[PDB]
Design a protein around this ligand. Structure first.
Ligand SMILES: O=P(O)(O)C[C@H](O)Cn1cncn1
Ligand SMILES: O=P(O)(O)C[C@H](O)Cn1cncn1
Ligand SMILES: O=P(O)(O)C[C@H](O)Cn1cncn1
Ligand SMILES: O=P(O)(O)C[C@H](O)Cn1cncn1
Ligand SMILES: O=P(O)(O)C[C@H](O)Cn1cncn1
Ligand SMILES: O=P(O)(O)C[C@H](O)Cn1cncn1
Ligand SMILES: [Mn+2]
Ligand SMILES: [Mn+2]
Ligand SMILES: [Mn+2]
Ligand SMILES: [Mn+2]
Ligand SMILES: [Mn+2]
Ligand SMILES: [Mn+2]
Ligand SMILES: [Mn+2]
Ligand SMILES: [Mn+2]
Ligand SMILES: [Mn+2]
Ligand SMILES: [Mn+2]
Ligand SMILES: [Mn+2]
Ligand SMILES: [Mn+2]
Lengths: 212, 212, 212, 212, 212, 212
């Protein structure tokens, strides 16, 4: 039902993102890697292959705790820094989430998610209203985690909310380990998207202005 | 099932509030306006007519995201300021919510709701315990929004929790637009009341002292 | 050549914006006002009719110093405050500017405009790159100007850059009259859009990634 | 289904804790008190008998709003202070919660609970991941409540998360009555455990590393 | 006598740790590296092979000054950062130390160790009491040492005390070289474990509550 | 017309820079790489090959928005840090710009360029007067971007203005992403050089002292 595939091709990166919000299986009929963080345990299949290993782990923890099936492919330039291949892999990952739920009606529209990870604590609220907005206040006192440049972790969530047309407030409340502090943000966003995209029932677009 | 009508008549305002917490249709057999923010889309009907237009919009966003059907009619004095017609239209709107749920049993009793609106972020918790309390910390750096006097927006929620016999903590966490900051508070309260008045199941009054 | 008409219809406002970036004449074949800030001096015709008079004057000064022909018709709710009829009349005014220039190629792409107005000084830079962004730092120490609520003046430029897919930095450098301070911002944006949408020549999309 | 009994016997205290997470009835076939806060209203039976009366009331409010059936029997030394009989009655109460849910799979894994009590406001998040952690920031400006020594209230929740192998962040946001401030923390933890131990469905261990 | 082998297998790392607290020789009958910091000088054999070279050097200096024989084999994911292969190689290294001394009786139970390294000075106290605790206050003003991410150095000792069920206070008193500051912490812990696990004599469990 | 080739050969780096300020095609008759950021779209050809990938991207964005055709070949020592191959490389790129415009007459002589990039804002002014000067105030709170050492980004523009005999003030006004903050500086310099080297007309050396 809620499936989409997005092939975003620019002169910096080549993207192919297939998503399924309700879970289940996924494949790719024609991949972009030559010769055709991976969890495939019979309910959801999530297999992310970007050039950045720590940014694979954040999309993986996002889709594991959202109930998503998600295949991410990215052939990006890594002789240059990791900005152009994290910003572009967040724009196309917001578009795949946007096309997978067309009609915003019959949903809760408001998800809030707290998630801890071992003294770090992050909340994420999400709004699903067609104006994009992103208030990402991860206070990270590190310059690079393993390959992510640690200022792209807010910039990923900035472009995710931008291209998915959602309003997003992610704020890490405490923590002093920045693997812990950044993974808890993606685990908190996974709780909020799961709560906002939910069967409200009664089949009504949840807005005053009637347009979502 | 959960319906109530409250006709509050004083020498300052005349009120008639009909509410339905489970949604559905509503009408008035004998209105107070002469010759007999309006959403009527087949699941819930919410039609608020106070003399204040911005206070219409806050009760509307409250009832739209609560699943309520709600008709509000307030004939109040507006040659004087808007205090006497916002305080009185919040006392009677807490009484209509109170009479619509008589027995507080089989409910979650604890609703917490975060709701953003475009860089503003408000949380609201609600308690449904028969002592009234209201801790409303909307930090509004404006004097009037469109017709509300912007200090009545906490005073509305003060008298709502007062006359509905609930404990309420509404706190705007961030934001620098006070339409955004005050509407997100009413959208957050709508999530919390929806979560506290919920089918817990097992038919038990959720209290240590056994009285709610 | 560079003309567009946008009819944005929601349950709060009804909009009809016809724009011509190269100037010249404009009309409307079927208007939204019943029975069919106005400058019509033989080179460009600019006629803005919103319910807010001071927001008419800011779109007028924007289109007068941009070389635009622009007709704006907004039927919005004014018994509620002026947010819903200024935000919506900025989203549709960014969409009309976006559809009027389809191919961003052969343009300067970078406009910077300083404009004074009688001790106020505002600069505006504009980027014409398909990610929207808005950094609007008008320091206004007023609550309402004549009918605008003076926090909507940054919120107008926020939604203009949002729906037009441009990056925008507007910053008032000095000034202590907020009519002067806000009009100089719209006069500075008019210089920047005029400078960014300009005949660069040589017919090339001005980007590293080749996509604009 | 989710039942466990823990008999923890040391030279300071003797403990016997029988728990049922899904509610229902409970008894003890051979008690530790001589000759064989009590709620027994036909859905859940919660009967706590420690030597500390205020620590009875906090385990009672924890199990009342969690849906638990819980019998606590602690024979501890009270001629010495109340540390050794509150720390030990929290270690065994985390072990009884741990043995009552063996397989952490098919659960939400992330519960967040806000709960007010009459100007006090506490949130509690819980993680159900097999590393124990406890960040308890109840700001209590009292030395003893009725018999608890008011620094054991964080030390109880420290040893509860320690022996139950969960990660826990309990933080009182406001309040100036420390009965209110400490009871709202246990009422907030009751919402979070109820939300984390919940039927997620689809029968999958919710972790990246696959081990919970 | 005091030997243990721990094979910890998760979907992130595969661990095999063989320890001997009294020294002597050690081998592995079936290793995890393909085709079958190393000191093997006739009294103790210590051979650590993790993917991190600086974390090899800290376990090596820990076991060299403890009298241990210790073989560490960790096959961990290093395309992601080094957190998951340092946290997991500290949990299994606390479990191997825990299983190597079963009965905590006849031991000093309290080891304190100061160790300098060239203007750095660290103390470490250790408690061997079955509640785990870790207060690690290495003040490191570096982000990465050679491959360790320099916030994992406290996180290693956190999970070591966690899984070994010991209470641990490691605090660097001075120093301005963070190789020196972190190696002196592991050399100080080696003095403390050597002092706590020591032949007290008289064969008695050293506790008031009689249970260790 | 405005073409130059500079082959700078030292014992640290070997450079070959061919430039064309008016655009058009460029080739190299005898390259320095064995066996003979690249944009070649029919108007200008820009192909930079230094050992640093992020410094390729900054010369590329400089020449893309200047109208330049530019081939850069730098064979530099990278077992040592990147200073000697970014400085050396900046000196020869100022000399190639200097030899490409011999007679400074008939030009505007004063270019100012603002350029944003996604909350970063940089201005650059340029003077084309034969005393070199460089006031570069990029406030970068990072140590390395991808391969550039992030203090060489001002040191590149220092040596560019030094060897090109121009006066240069580059100042980033805001921004909190240092890829954004440093790329906007090179995009702002591209606007300023384009504006200073411009057909003023009337064929006069624009100076009081008559010598440029
Ligand atoms: O958020 P909505 O669309 O449900 C109705 C809002 O009132 C529209 N809005 C946009 N800014 C402030 N309000
Ligand atoms: O809130 P309840 O009624 O469930 C039981 C409370 O303990 C009563 N109370 C009122 N103030 C402090 N406690
Ligand atoms: O701005 P562009 O598209 O010309 C190339 C940029 O490098 C892309 N980008 C986006 N963020 C940082 N860089
Ligand atoms: O929390 P998990 O087990 O779901 C996967 C985590 O990434 C493991 N971890 C432990 N510290 C940081 N991460
Ligand atoms: O540490 P022990 O077990 O020797 C006896 C302690 O008194 C127990 N305890 C735990 N917290 C405070 N005391
Ligand atoms: O800048 P010029 O050469 O046009 C004339 C200047 O006055 C020369 N100068 C150099 N320092 C101060 N003035
Ligand atoms: Mn970017
Ligand atoms: Mn992780
Ligand atoms: Mn009042
Ligand atoms: Mn509104
Ligand atoms: Mn708005
Ligand atoms: Mn004016
Ligand atoms: Mn204790
Ligand atoms: Mn109480
Ligand atoms: Mn960890
Ligand atoms: Mn060393
Ligand atoms: Mn130098
Ligand atoms: Mn870039």
């Amino acid at each position: 039902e809620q499936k989409a595939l997005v092939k975003r091709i620019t002169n910096e990166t080549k993207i192919q993102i297939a998503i399924s919000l309700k879970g289940g299986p996924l494949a790719i009929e024609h991949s972009i890697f030559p010769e055709k963080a991976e969890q495939a345990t019979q309910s959801q299949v999530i297999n992310v292959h970007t050039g950045i290993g720590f940014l694979d782990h954040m999309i993986h923890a996002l889709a594991k705790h959202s109930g998503w099936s998600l295949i991410v492919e990215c052939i990006g330039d890594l002789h240059i820094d990791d900005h152009h291949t994290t910003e572009d892999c967040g724009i196309a990952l917001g578009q795949a989430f946007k096309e997978a739920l067309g009609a915003v009606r019959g949903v809760k529209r408001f998800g809030s998610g707290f998630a801890p990870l071992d003294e770090a604590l992050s909340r994420a609220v999400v709004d699903l209203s067609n104006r994009p907005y992103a208030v990402v206040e991860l206070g990270l006192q590190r310059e690079k985690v393993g390959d992510l440049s640690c200022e792209m972790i807010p910039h990923f969530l900035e472009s995710f909310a931008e291209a998915s047309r959602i309003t997003l407030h992610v704020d890490c409340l405490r923590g002093k380990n920045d693997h812990h502090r950044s993974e808890s943000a993606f685990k908190a966003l996974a709780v909020a998207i799961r709560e906002a995209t939910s069967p409200n029932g009664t089949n009504d677009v949840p807005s005053t202005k009637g347009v979502l």
